[PDB]
Amino acid sequence: GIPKWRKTHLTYRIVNYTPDLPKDAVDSAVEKALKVWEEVTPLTFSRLYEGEADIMISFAVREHGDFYPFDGPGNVLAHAYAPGPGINGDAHFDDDEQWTKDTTGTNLFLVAAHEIGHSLGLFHSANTEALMYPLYHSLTDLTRFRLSQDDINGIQSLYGP
Ligand SMILES: COc1ccc(S(=O)(=O)N(CC(=O)NO)CC(C)C)cc1
Ligand SMILES: [Ca+2]
Ligand SMILES: [Ca+2]
Ligand SMILES: [Zn+2]
Ligand SMILES: [Zn+2]
C-alpha cells in the first residue's frame, strides 16, 4: 500500500538551520517546497513546531555517520524517508556545505522540495526537469524551474484526485 500509512494529511517540523542564509530562507524553502506539492495534487500539510511531528526536517553537521559522515564538496547533500514505520517522514540537510538560493552552491529551495517528495512516498524519477531527478544539473536559470510530468506521475500514484 503506497500513501503514508493511508493518511492524506501530515505535519512538517523545521528544526534545521542554515547560518549562511537567514531563517527566512530555511523556513521559506520548506514552505515553498510544501506549497508547490499542493499546487500539483490535493494532498495537504502544515508546518509547525509541536515536539517531533509526522515529518521532522533537522540539521546534520558532521554527524550523519548513519550512511556517510561530513563530505562537504560531495554529491550526497540531504535525505528524507517515506515507506517507513518511524522514519515515515524524517529528513536531514548538510551544514558541511554552502546552502544557497541563487545557484552558487547548494540550491536550498530545490534540495528542500526534493526532501518533501522523498518523504511523501516518491523515489527518484528520470526526466532532467523533475524535482525527483537524482542529479543537480546546476542550471543557473531559476526562472525555468518547474515540476515534471514524471515526478507528478509518482505523487499521483500516492494519493491522486
Ligand atoms: C533534486 O534534489 C536533490 C536532493 C537531494 C539529493 S542527494 O544528493 O542528497 N541524494 C540523497 C537522497 O536520496 N536524498 O533523499 C541523492 C544522491 C546520493 C544520488 C539530490 C537531489
Ligand atoms: Ca555534501
Ligand atoms: Ca517521522
Ligand atoms: Zn539520517
Ligand atoms: Zn532522494
From Swiss-Prot:
GO terms for cellular component: cytosol; extracellular matrix; extracellular region; extracellular space; mitochondrion; nucleus. Its main location: secreted. It is found in: Secreted, Extracellular space, Extracellular matrix; Nucleus; Cytoplasm. The keyword Nucleus applies. Transmembrane segments: none annotated. Directly cleaved by HTRA2 to produce active form. Zn(2+) 2 binds at H114, H118, H124. Ca(2+) 2 binds at D54, G86, N88, D90. One of its GO terms (biological process) is proteolysis. Ca(2+) 1 binds at D20, D95, E97. Ca(2+) 3 binds at D71, G72, G74, V76, D94, E97. Coiled coil: none annotated. The active site is at E115. One of its GO terms (molecular function) is metallopeptidase activity. Keywords: Calcium, Collagen degradation, Cytoplasm, Disulfide bond, Extracellular matrix, Hydrolase, Immunity, Innate immunity, Metal-binding, Metalloprotease, Nucleus, Protease, Repeat, Secreted, Signal, Zinc, Zymogen. Zn(2+) 1 binds at H64, D66, H79, H92. The conserved cysteine present in the cysteine-switch motif binds the catalytic zinc ion, thus inhibiting the enzyme. The dissociation of the cysteine from the zinc ion upon the activation-peptide release activates the enzyme. It is linked to Coronary heart disease 6: A multifactorial disease characterized by an imbalance between myocardial functional requirements and the capacity of the coronary vessels to supply sufficient blood flow. Decreased capacity of the coronary vessels is often associated with thickening and loss of elasticity of the coronary arteries. Belongs to the peptidase M10A family. Metalloproteinase with a rather broad substrate specificity that can degrade fibronectin, laminin, gelatins of type I, III, IV, and V; collagens III, IV, X, and IX, and cartilage proteoglycans. Activates different molecules including growth factors, plasminogen or other matrix metalloproteinases such as MMP9. Once released into the extracellular matrix (ECM), the inactive pro-enzyme is activated by the plasmin cascade signaling pathway. Also acts intracellularly. This is Stromelysin-1. It comes from Homo sapiens (Human). The gene is MMP3. The chain holds residues 105 to 265 of 477 of the full protein.
